[PDB]
Amino acid sequence: ELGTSNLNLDARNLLAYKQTEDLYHQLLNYPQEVISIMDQTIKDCMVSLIVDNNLDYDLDEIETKFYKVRPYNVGSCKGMRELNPNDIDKLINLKGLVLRSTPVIPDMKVAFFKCNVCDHTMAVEIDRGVIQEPARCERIDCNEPNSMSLIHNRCSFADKQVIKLQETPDFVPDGQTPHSISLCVYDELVDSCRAGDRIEVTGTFRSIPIRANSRQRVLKSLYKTYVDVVHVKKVITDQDLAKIREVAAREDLYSLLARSIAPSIYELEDVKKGILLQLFGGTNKTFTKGGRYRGDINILLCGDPSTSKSQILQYVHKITPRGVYTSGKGSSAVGLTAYITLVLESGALVLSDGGVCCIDEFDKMSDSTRSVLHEVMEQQTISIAKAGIITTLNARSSILASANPIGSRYNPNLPVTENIDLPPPLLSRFDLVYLVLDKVDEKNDRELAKHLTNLYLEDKPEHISQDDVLPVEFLTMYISYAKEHIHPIITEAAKTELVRAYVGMRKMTATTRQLESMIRLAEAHAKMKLKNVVELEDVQEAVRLIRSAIKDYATDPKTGKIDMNLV
Amino acid sequence: ARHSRFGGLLSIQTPDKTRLTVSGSQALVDEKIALQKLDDSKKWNKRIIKAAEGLPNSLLNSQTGKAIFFTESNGKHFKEFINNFIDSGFNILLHSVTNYFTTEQDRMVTLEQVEYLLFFAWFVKYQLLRSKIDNSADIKQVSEALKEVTFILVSSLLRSAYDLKNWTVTHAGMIAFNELLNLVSRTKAATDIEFIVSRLFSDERIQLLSNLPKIGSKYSLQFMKSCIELTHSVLKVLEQYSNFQKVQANYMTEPVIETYINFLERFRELEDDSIKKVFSFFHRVFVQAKEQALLFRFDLIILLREMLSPDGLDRMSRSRKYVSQFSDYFLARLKKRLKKSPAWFVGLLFPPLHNSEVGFYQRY
Amino acid sequence: LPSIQLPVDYNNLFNEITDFLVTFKQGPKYMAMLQKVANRELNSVIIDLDDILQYQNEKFLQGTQADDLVSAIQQNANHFTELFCRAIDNNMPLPTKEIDYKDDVLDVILNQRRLRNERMLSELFPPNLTRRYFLYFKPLSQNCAAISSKPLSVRQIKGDFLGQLITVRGIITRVSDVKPAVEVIAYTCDQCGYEVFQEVNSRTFTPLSECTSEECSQNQTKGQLFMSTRASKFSAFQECKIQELSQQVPVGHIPRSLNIHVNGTLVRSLSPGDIVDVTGIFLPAPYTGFKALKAGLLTETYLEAQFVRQHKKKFASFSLTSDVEERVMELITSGDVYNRLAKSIAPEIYGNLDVKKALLLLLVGGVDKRVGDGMKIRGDINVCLMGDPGVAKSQLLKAICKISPRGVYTTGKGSSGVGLTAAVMKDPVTDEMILEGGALVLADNGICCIDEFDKMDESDRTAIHEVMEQQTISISKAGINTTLNARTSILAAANPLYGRYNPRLSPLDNINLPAALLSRFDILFLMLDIPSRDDDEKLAEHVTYVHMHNKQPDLDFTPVEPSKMREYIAYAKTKRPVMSEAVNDYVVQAYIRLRQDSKREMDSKFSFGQATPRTLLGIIRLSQALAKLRLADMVDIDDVEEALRLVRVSKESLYQ
Amino acid sequence: TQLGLPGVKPSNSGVTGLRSLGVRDLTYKISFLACHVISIGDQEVFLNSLS
Amino acid sequence: VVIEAGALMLADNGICCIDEFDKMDISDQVAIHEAMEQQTISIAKAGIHATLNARTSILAAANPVGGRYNRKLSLRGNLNMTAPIMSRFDLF
Amino acid sequence: RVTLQEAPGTVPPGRLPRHREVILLADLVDVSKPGEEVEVTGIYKNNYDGNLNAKNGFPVFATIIEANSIKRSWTEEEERE
DNA sequence: ACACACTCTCCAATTCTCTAA
DNA sequence: TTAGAGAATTGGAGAGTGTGTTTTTTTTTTTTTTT
Ligand SMILES: Nc1ncnc2c1ncn2[C@@H]1O[C@H](COP(=O)(O)OP(=O)(O)NP(=O)(O)O)[C@@H](O)[C@H]1O
Ligand SMILES: Nc1ncnc2c1ncn2[C@@H]1O[C@H](COP(=O)(O)OP(=O)(O)NP(=O)(O)O)[C@@H](O)[C@H]1O
Ligand SMILES: [Mg+2]
Ligand SMILES: [Mg+2]
């Protein structure tokens, strides 16, 4: 009734039903024959349903279609280096990360012949890669040799594509670099996957010979190997909606969500809150004219060493559906954006499109490399003009940055802008800037010491910082749904408060970007409550968080230094 | 469904535990296809044998299931020209040209013979068709063809052509003599015409017209088709004469049946109408005359599978009505015969056996 | 065309082989192995030449003559792999246990083919197709010893050795990934339903295309042949390269190298950067086809691997056989292992006992931790030595470089931050970009020694920051975007600012390291050269003795040798001792005092910076290392107070 | 190149067994065969152009 | 050389936009200067010679040195641009 | 042989210049020097080329110009003036 | 010298024709 | 009406011959000497 052709099948169901317990093993040992058997079973069953239940559907339509099974969840995954010559032509399962995909290649399936003298025609079937050309023209009165000929553009073809899969770092040997394997994919699955995707696959592990030269039938003794995929997987219900709506009604929701993104990290509540709002994001806007306005939030974490900044970046890197983690000394201008190779290739900010890009040791990279970020942060586009290539690419990428001040420990005898030491055109582009300080206090220190030492009372700890936190899976569901379905709008009340608040920060330095970032933060706060409107409460929270992040209340308003006693 | 290099391998085991190997994914499920694909690999074909030359392209040596194409003004102008020709000129032209050629037959050349026989044929047929369609037309316009002199002349051309083994004139003469008979059955469906029939069906001519399908087996596809259509007409007239049992037994024997099958197996090229004619004849041989033993021969049994399969004759053409209604009866009578006398299993491969003492029981 | 006599007849040696396989014992030794092969329990047979030598001696002492099979299979090793295989196939016993025979395609195919021949009647296939096992020779023990027992450097492998069985010593430079190689290929004929086989030895082959079978031919059946994987035979293949040690290269020359081939169960034994004693068969590689006609008489060559001996056992290779158990029981029963093991590090250096104890705890290291939400915490310990010239810093550092099974030594001036970590080189002629790991990757799961740490450039030292705490490397450059693993502990040495330590300034002025880097060392030891007529005399008497005798002076103390020391440390690195509440309270209370004292004295001449949270986990790591060395499963307060003492002593040099 | 082009020698797997190829292997590329192009990016002439 | 057209060729009889001009290398600012001087481009290498027309008007954006403008100083003091290039803008 | 290129004043805006190659025979060799602006009369001619056909994949012929002629003091009155 | 493309040649398998029982 | 003796036409088996093959940028990461 949906008019569709492919059926998923997790192989464990073959073990549950008694009559198919042995078919499960036969599937793994003989995939090419068994899968074909399954296909021709499904098609016949579909016909039987309409003819037995005597329904109105066209029998010819069902007879015309192809139906295919796609088995999955076959068994344990196998390490890419541990495939051996006794695995050839058996089913395999692999995990990995996608590097690149070649463009679609036409693959011939039926050949078309025409007689040069009498114009008789024949369609011929291709199997095992060889065209079975006729010896003589088959028309009775024109029984002549060498009389038929091939017509290329009246043949029939099919789509083939090759995907390059790389080994995940979890499996690499000690003191070595990851390897890769090539996947061949056909028809439905062709354009499914992009660079930087993370997937699990299922397919036959094949091997073939290769020729010594293009003139002759001489083969080499070593054989090429590859994988022939039949299924790909990425690594809703009314009950889910009921759970989401019920959770959204809790009073302690904002604190619950914030303390649950990084459960084992002690306090740092404002940092967690700001990161949560970066995860939700603002709203994307496009006009008929006057351009488009970014929904994404950029955050900078700056302060003393040992303060657990980099530990927080780990959580964000694993929570986000798409994203990258990298280091200041590890990155070049080309590697961060795009690379000429004549073809163009993607860098970190392009792979991270629609996600979060985590940059650590931000204070180590040079002014030359950091200057690349101005255009990408402001416009969310990358313009390129080099020999043989000139174009512009989209980069809807959120930056999360980590750095330590000049002198490597925060110096209270310098003003804040001089301790941070980024130039103003770049410091102006962050929505939130955090100061975090290693202030001594016996009350704080006893709690921190008890928290860290409690992790060593067990071999594999069950202990966790708080009684009530949400599981990562459900939290991901909440954030994803809220990003898709909710789109808040400005209320007149919110407009009045935003104008008032901006004039308050301005009249005394607040730039025009403080206004837009306030709007964006308020919108992010509204989504997190599943509201369709921005209200006064949301605007006031956006203002409060900005004032709290850069320690403004403790700042001397005239000299720009911070009184450490007030922290 | 899946691509050309996905394919597995299949093994098929016979009785006596011997095994064969075939490739491809459809062979896994369809044994009919596997059996056909198995034999299709084998290299040899027996090489083959081959009637007309010297004259311009025409109905005699081309497949005429291919028209030529008219503007509307041209269609109506051409129709007007030959319609006025027929209503005005035809009898006066034929009467002169025929009473010439009776005085000059010995001196003829092949072309003039093939012209005369394919001018006669065209105009007689076209008029029959035109008055079949409409009452404004009448058959009297072509009525010069029947009078006795022309009948003798078409007969004499066919006679002399057959004796000297000139096969092209024989072919054209076959076409002309077909139409004369067709026209006679028209006029009998309304005096002298019965006299003309009685003279047309003297014993000598029955010997000739019986002889003619037997030699057709060797020749081109049109020749056999002319033989069939002439035979259909020839028997149908003598059916409506009321002699008949003598004449029909004259037709029924192995070398005629051979021609009928040899023609029938090229059915992909033929019309819907010609197959109606062939099965009419098999109904005559098998049911009426009760000479069942002729058709128990294997290359007929192959044929009915090809033609009746989802391969060949369309699921809804009128042909399948006739064919399946024939084969049902065929196999019923075959079942009865084989269980009564098991020797026919080895009979079915070979021609019937002409010995006196065993052959009579064999045929019945 | 011509022919010669030679002293060897292979019939006699074949008879010796078949007697040896069924008679020798240390039931007979090799028949147990062949029973395991027959049961499908075992995939390879390793022949010991020490057995053949023993067998020859025993047969001689029984008063009978015998051929010297040991030299005979060293001189012409290639031929005897076939002789032993034929003998094994002849003498193979029947299975002891059920097998589930129907799992084998070749069994079904050959059974059906035999049945076809049986029906038709109312060598068949090459024997290589059914050899389920691999066979290798192991060279003579040098302590029994012959050339195969004596290692050669890659220069000494002249053209004389082609065909012989030899041993080679060197470093591996690169390793290929595994791919299949054909041995016997299988085909199917369509029309006559019959199967044929082809055997491949050369680097290339022509596949068959006509069914030349006599029955098929006599039926004039010119059928088509098609290839099949499902009944072909493959074997695993891998190729490597070995290169001579840099300290054996003669002056002004460039180092040489050899190509190594590996098949069967021996695959993925070698790894890059290993120092190893490979042994195998050295052979030529002939050309094929038209190339051979115009290649000339110069032959390419390579080494077939047979057996591999590593110089140092990696800690991951440990298992507690009773042979090792008996030796660790010596140390356990003797007692006071902490002091004995520390005193045993570099005995030729006088004094410095607390420094040696700290470096022993560096060799052991803390416990890796991974929390239920996905956070992970460093287990490795980092140490630094800061001191005056001429106090054996470089010497002690280079001594610890011998004990560790994986380790590298580097100096600050000779090193790039890139080459120290990982590099993106445009290395091939094809303009491809490839990543190649640096020193900190080669030291993965080991120690990295960095001398002259104060001479290295301030910008390049920042490359070490990520590796020190997170134990990983992250790169985003042209065409490459990946993370590597670097689970390495760093040991470094430096002189203070202005060279000799200056008492006019504070310790932090003399140290001259930034706060973020000074925090990443778990211990920084400060050692000063202060004259004393009494101590100088004792040191001089010790050193002069060592120069006189090549031995440390001893009256009471016997050091444990490095091998038994490695066994004890390797056994100790398996324990994972847990903390307890009584211990937790004590360390929690200690930490508060450290930060209060730091806050009080940030102004003071006795300042060393401020105690961060990374100083708490340093105490836990040192405590757990001490718990490992006493082979406990539980940290004790006795460990914590020692861990605090060892941190306190580092600063006492400031007080003369 | 893999076909019988006069004067030129022969040069992911293709198709084979065709007469002209012998033992060689043939592949293909996709391109577009257009039939017209239209772009979408003196005052008297200009005025005559306007409606 | 690959010859294929650059940005100034596509902007012939058009407006060419340069953003963050001050970040451009001196080695490339001089190329723009030479083109702007003549409204002409020249190629001579590898045995191939060519001359092309570049009747293009330039629109540029830049940052003052140190990120903020100094009212105490001339525009020349504030801007990281060489005097011959500065001399060829009609308006600032 | 000489390579001839469109003069820059003739080329339309926003387009690259085109090229052709000219063959000079017995009397015409060294009649012109690189960088000169020149005018040519001759036959326009073509021939088969295997490499063009191989690279483009269509039966495409190559073309050349065969030159027939090529083109680019004072009186007493001037001296007296 | 080693797979290929192409040419040449001879020999027997086949069908056609004539004669007599 | 069968069949057997003699003649003509065609197929492709297989033998032979000649042939071809080895083999100035432009962009981007890194070390080194030069102002
Ligand atoms: N509040 C905290 N909660 C949990 N762990 C903490 C906390 N404060 C410090 N730590 C621990 O102290 C260490 C901090 O390391 P790290 O994440 O690199 O901090 P950082 O801010 O990045 N310091 P640095 O890299 O020197 O600038 C880790 O072992 C943390 O587990
Ligand atoms: N306690 C000691 N016992 C034995 N030899 C010692 C001792 N102290 C110093 N030496 C000798 O001092 C010499 C120099 O040692 P070395 O390791 O090169 O010093 P260093 O600390 O690296 N000095 P430097 O590199 O200039 O900072 C060696 O020959 C040692 O034998
Ligand atoms: Mg950190
Ligand atoms: Mg030193």
Ligand SMILES: [Zn+2]
């Ligand atoms: Zn044809």
Ligand SMILES: [Zn+2]
């Ligand atoms: Zn065969």
